[PDB]
């Protein structure tokens, strides 16, 4: 009475029906029921149920029935023992918190790593490199006019190409030189067409224009367009914030870049990662805060009387200069530029630079654990074929 | 003779009666007894002791009676060896000092993160934000009032808002604008508000008032208070303690900050890593002695002889001023305000370099390990949901 | 029916002839055939087939028949699993990709560190200095040649070791002293008298001249012989860039070093993380050049409007200045040089810091651990003995 | 015919007498032999040999046998394999090299951690502080004057301390109070008393000066008894000498740390790790070399052709000069002192920290993972209790 024997996968595992029983509604329990010969594949011979099942992690479902914990098998990768227990019936909420977070470990890396004739040719210009032969020598070409025009851009700043002339009518301005004019409307001649090309075909316009890429393409072709349409006195201003959008024409190469896999998994790392992001940014205003003050009243305690200001010899004459000075500290960075200049400063500056090191190396490591991990699965994705299917499912 | 097969969960474990009887009062020491056919479960068909237990671990408690060194097996999370050897009846504390550190791990951080009609609604406000709606907007207005109070501090130390009057009675300070005062005083009666209403329900007044939070609280609200209290000649000198003592007004944010997890995990950790704290403080204090005393001793070697003081080149003008040198060094810091200036000092220089990273990289590796496993364990425990109780437990 | 026991290593595995029916053209789908008692060892008196193997992992092997997926049994190394699926006929390319970066790691490790009478006397002076005594005597003599060559070197570049004479004919320089010349002379004839000797034995020429060893020793040994060559129009340019190759001549002490297992781990690590350096080296360019445009045009917010120059008072008068900076500060060197002096400056640098504190802890780690996996690996190999070959397999 | 089934612990194991005699001489060869029956506890009702072993690495043992190559199984501490293959008569150093670093680790952690009636009580001021009263209050006593000797020391090295008096005889220098002198008497006669009492009882004089801490100790009290003993030409230049032994001591320090858990551990971890120390500091050296080189050629590419000298511009007048700079650059510490000032020298300055970083992070991560094992294991030593043998060992 009492004794039931599952077979599974040919090991022989033995318990109490009492021990099925605890756990209602589960497949096992139902086993534990007397009308179970009809139910379930059995052989009256040796009185066994018969389960074609990986056993050795049957062994741990089985251990969860009888002392009322489930725990992850740590032998077996986590979606293995995910797709026993589903087949079980036992729902994979239940493991301990102890065992949770290193058994959805490859799963969680798996979820976070996830006319009309010439039309194709068309769109064949934005695909892949790689897929054509058109699609390669386009974004060869795409990519030294990106370069050509940073470049551009990098020197127009310069002081070198932007000499002063004697011109009044009495104001006098550095001036561009000719030639960065003009390979700057080459440049966006080439951007231009690119454009309209990449226009002419654009399926789901809503996610079209949702598209950064896209967004960021043409607010960085919209300032040079606008020298035509430039009233003088709105002008004035649309001109000078248009500078600082130009600034963005340097965010192009992410247009290039973005079939590069470690950005990729970049991209994924961060989008994953927000809430020690979030952390680390937490640590790092507490303790900026409070050190920036620590430091400021540090350093007042040797002032000197004679002068009449606070603070006259030292650096922190007031808090947010302390936020500047505990960033560099903290950071082990240390320009130079402020530093304590008291005994109890350098008690404080010490104490801020440890704090500066632990604080950081605190959420840093899970940030870099989360990219590494990412990253692995990445390049196990690409070395590995796309897909055989050699297995031939059995029908049900 | 002597040969005794124990059937654990179905498998059996063949052994002679001997190695049983070798570690006496524990069960399986009562199996190799005589008396034993009573006293546990056991079937005269097979000759075998049934015992309804996980096989996989019986395993190594029975190589351990074999043998006789306990170790803990590597594939199972430590709480379920841990259980299955309390019911076998070995002493959990016999494991070998190779295997206790990974072995008491899952438990170690499971420790580690462990009228009167309208008084629940006077108390809501002080519960989590959560947990109701006016407890959600209570916790946001403070919010923004004690970023306002602390925003209103650190413009008070600024000089702008500081300028010195033409003032004479003949002493002349800089004053603070009146604008900062009013916003002081408005912030100081909502604080009054809400430590009144907190006040109001205070249940085990003996650990309201151990809670560091309530007393921080109360500190930060005392020196506003004191303006009316406020002999003249002890009041120069509590006000003079009074402005150190408003420095703690920009504590009030750990009020807000608590509610956070990272926070919490960080206190845990911090806790929990005691002596690896005082293991750095050690090292550090010991590198900084050495290498102070070595740098103040290696720039005299050069030391011009027409000069009456022993240095005058060097920024190494004493010991201490090593110190600081030595700290700023070894944590990689290197502000650069006192640095080397001879091929000995240089030497020791890039000693104290070296000797820094690695003695700053002994123990800090431990700490970020802690906090990494109780972070894990943290979010493993919200993303989980909080209890179901699936198992229903045999009767005994 | 359908019901077939596999006998691996003497643990029966019982699974229906469908799931092995499943993956045709493997052993286990033979076995499933009618035509399986002449094909595989089999006793009709327990109709169990028999196969020599370890049970273990055919565990495994049954549970990718059953379910459909290959993965790696994390009990194992890589290469027992991968000889067992060898065996079972199992293609190796079809683990999961979880799965796939843990199994592929000692495999990846161990393909990674992977007249004619006295010429065996003539080329032991190039062999291992270990492999004899007159190799080592050599090995040690060459050894203090070569850093005497360096130190003069060194010394030669010297202030002390140059003075300028007052010589015209009216033109006066710094000349270097006849011992330096002296030594340097020694120090060649020594360094071709190996030469001459190594020359005198070059089995596979070819591959002697691709050894990248004696081009630089050639090269190196090259611009002193050429005194006596010394057009005297050419000459001069030749000599200009002849203390250029001369500056290669610190490239002799890699014939030294080349005996050491550290740098030959180092080169191992090197040639197999390519991917990851080319990575680290994006996310840099990426990160400079982003945060030195964004540090160039914060600085200008506060500019002063009086000055004629864009920026008078800022370190960043162009980009690539910001360049330089934006290097400095990402891998927190921080030297002092420039630092930003602007609120909105000092915003972009704390950004930078952090930033370049996160995309140097990216790819880092993994080229460590591929570094200590190496090293790891070869001071095994170094401390258990060549070969012994106990095992005597048996005939097929 | 040719089929043995051993019995290890009640789990039967299938193989074939060849595969048992492949590897000669071992225990289960002996079994392939047919003079087994006598030799080996067999019962002819089952035909199978009964062992009283694990049967859980028996697989791999057996394994071992069958295809040639031993691996350690990843799921047994390393010390548990080790006396399996110990019984069984398999050599441990057969074991594949990828698999041996992880196998010899605990053990290698092991290893690496390892007149007369009143003489107890004489030397019970030497043993431990918590082994007696007396010992801890002498613990303590010497604690407090080691701590006032070094703040004697730290304070008659400073300039307040050292004011120069206007006497002549014609030299003035600085002198010491007399409050320092009386103290370090004190100090001196208290030590002078303890070292009397060590040398009471010196069991193996030997030993006893080859202990380290007693040679500091004498070094260290050898100075102050010379101001007696002080030829007064030779007396100046042993006191010249005599000054930097008193430098030591400070070392008296580690007299109070020796009791310290944490300073062991780093003792342990030092002497354990001397190739990772040679191997960073022959990469540190090479690096140092080829960058200084580098540098001081690149600075010289912008030099201006006006002035005499090579270079008058750049810090970097020579090579040495370049190696500090490499030295506070590779360690990212960056002091500010010197740095590059041509785009030349800033492109190598930049690949001078990067080399920094990686070479820097290459061994220290070895020396911490060595450091993490050993301190884990002296921590499980510390937490369990001493010994208790509840194990009583069978009779053989
Ligand atoms: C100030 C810095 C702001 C940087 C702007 C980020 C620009 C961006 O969005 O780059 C994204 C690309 C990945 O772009 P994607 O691979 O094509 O997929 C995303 C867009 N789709 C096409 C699906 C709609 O590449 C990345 O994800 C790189 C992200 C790393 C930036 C940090
Ligand atoms: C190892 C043990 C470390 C314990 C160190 C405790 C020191 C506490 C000192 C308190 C008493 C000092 C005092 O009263 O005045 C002594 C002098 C005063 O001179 P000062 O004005 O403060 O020096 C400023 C530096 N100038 C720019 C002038 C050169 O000040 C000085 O001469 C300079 C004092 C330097 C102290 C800096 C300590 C920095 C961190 C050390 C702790 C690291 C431990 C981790
Ligand atoms: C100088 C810096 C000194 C910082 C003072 C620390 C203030 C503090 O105690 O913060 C504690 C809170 C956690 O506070 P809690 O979650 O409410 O629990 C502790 C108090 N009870 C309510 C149980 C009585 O939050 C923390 O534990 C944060 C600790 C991190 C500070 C480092
Ligand atoms: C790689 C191999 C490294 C071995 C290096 C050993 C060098 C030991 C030098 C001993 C002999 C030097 C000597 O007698 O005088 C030579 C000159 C003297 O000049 P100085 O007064 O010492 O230079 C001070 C710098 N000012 C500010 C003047 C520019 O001094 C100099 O010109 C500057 C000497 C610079 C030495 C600094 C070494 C810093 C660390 C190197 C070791 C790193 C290895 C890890
Ligand atoms: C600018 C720095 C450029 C450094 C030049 C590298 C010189 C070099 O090639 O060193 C290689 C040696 C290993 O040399 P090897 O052990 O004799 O094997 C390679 C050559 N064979 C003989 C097989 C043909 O040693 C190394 O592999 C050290 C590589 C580490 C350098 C970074
Ligand atoms: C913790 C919470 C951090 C939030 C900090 C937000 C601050 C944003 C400030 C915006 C408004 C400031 C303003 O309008 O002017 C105030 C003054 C202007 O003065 P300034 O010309 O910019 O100062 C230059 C420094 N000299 C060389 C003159 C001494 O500027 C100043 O007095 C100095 C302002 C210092 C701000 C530096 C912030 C550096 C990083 C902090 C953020 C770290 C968080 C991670
Ligand atoms: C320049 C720095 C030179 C430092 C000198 C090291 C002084 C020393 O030897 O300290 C050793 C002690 C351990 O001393 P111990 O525990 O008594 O054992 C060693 C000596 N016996 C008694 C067995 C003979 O403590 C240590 O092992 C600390 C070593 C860490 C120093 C780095
Ligand atoms: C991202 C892409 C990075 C690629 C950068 C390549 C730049 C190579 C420059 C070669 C041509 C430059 C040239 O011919 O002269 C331009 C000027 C000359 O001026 P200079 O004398 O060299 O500047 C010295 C700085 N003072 C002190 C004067 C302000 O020089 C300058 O104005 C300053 C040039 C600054 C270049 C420093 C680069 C530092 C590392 C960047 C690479 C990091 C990638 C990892
Ligand atoms: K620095
Ligand atoms: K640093
Ligand atoms: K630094
Ligand atoms: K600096
Ligand atoms: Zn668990
Ligand atoms: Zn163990
Ligand atoms: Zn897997
Ligand atoms: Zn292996």
Same mark, same amino acid.
């Given at each position: +009475? ?35 010969? +009809?139910? %379930? ?8 149920? %018969?389960?074609?099942?990986? &056993? ?12 009322? #914990? ?14 026993? *227990? ?13 065992? !949770? ?9 798996? =979820?976070? *790593?996830? !006319? ?14 790689? +897929? ?17 025009? @940073? ?17 009044? =009518? ?13 390979? =700057? ?17 654009? &399926? ?5 224009? #949702? ?42 190469? %992410? ?19 927000? /809430?020690? $992001?979030? *952390?680390?940014?937490? $640590? ?10 620590? @430091? ?27 936020? !500047? ?34 604080? @950081? ?8 654990? /989360? ?23 059995? &029908? &049900?």
């Amino acid at each position: +009475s009492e004794r039931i024997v599952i077979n599974v996968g040919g090991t022989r595992h033995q318990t109490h029906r009492s021990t099925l029983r605890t756990l209602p509604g589960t497949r096992l329990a139902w086993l534990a029921e007397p009308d179970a010969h +009809s139910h %379930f594949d059995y052989d009256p011979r040796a009185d066994e149920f %018969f389960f074609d099942r990986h &056993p050795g992690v049957f062994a741990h479902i089985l251990n969860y029935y009888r002392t009322g #914990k489930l725990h992850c098998p740590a032998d077996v990768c986590g979606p293995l023992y995910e797709e026993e *227990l589903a087949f079980w019936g036992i729902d994979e909420t239940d493991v301990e918190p102890c065992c !949770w977070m290193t058994y959805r470990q490859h799963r969680d890396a798996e =979820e976070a *790593l996830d !006319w009309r004739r010439w039309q194709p040719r068309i769109w064949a210009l934005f695909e892949d490199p790689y +897929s054509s032969r058109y699609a390669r020598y386009v974004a060869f070409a795409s990519l030294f006019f990106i370069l050509v025009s @940073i470049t551009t851009f990098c020197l127009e700043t310069h002081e070198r190409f932007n000499p002063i002339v004697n011109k009044t =009518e009495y104001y006098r301005e550095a001036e561009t030189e000719a030639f960065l004019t003009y390979i =700057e409307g080459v440049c966006v001649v080439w951007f231009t067409f690119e454009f309209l090309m990449r226009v002419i075909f654009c &399926p789901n316009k809503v996610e079209f224009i #949702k598209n950064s890429l896209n967004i960021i393409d043409f607010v960085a072709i919209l300032p040079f367009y606008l020298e035509v349409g430039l009233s003088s006195k709105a002008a004035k201003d649309v001109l000078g914030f248009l500078r600082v959008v130009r600034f963005v024409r340097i965010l192009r190469i %992410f247009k290039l870049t973005r079939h590069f896999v470690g950005l990729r998994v970049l991209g994924h790392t961060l989008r994953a990662s927000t /809430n020690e $992001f979030l *952390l680390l940014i937490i $640590f790092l205003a507490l303790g900026v805060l409070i050190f920036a003050t620590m @430091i400021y009243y540090a350093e007042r305690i040797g002032a000197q009387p004679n002068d009449p200001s606070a603070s006259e010899h030292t650096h922190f004459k007031n808090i947010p200069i302390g936020f !500047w000075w505990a960033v560099v500290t903290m950071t082990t960075l240390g320009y130079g530029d402020m530093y304590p200049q008291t005994w109890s400063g350098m008690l404080v500056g010490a104490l801020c630079a440890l704090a500066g090191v632990l604080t @950081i190396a605190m959420p840093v490591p899970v940030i870099v654990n /989360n990219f590494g991990m990412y990253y692995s699965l990445a390049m196990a994705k690409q070395k590995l074929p796309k897909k055989k299917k050699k297995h031939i499912p059995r &029908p &049900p």
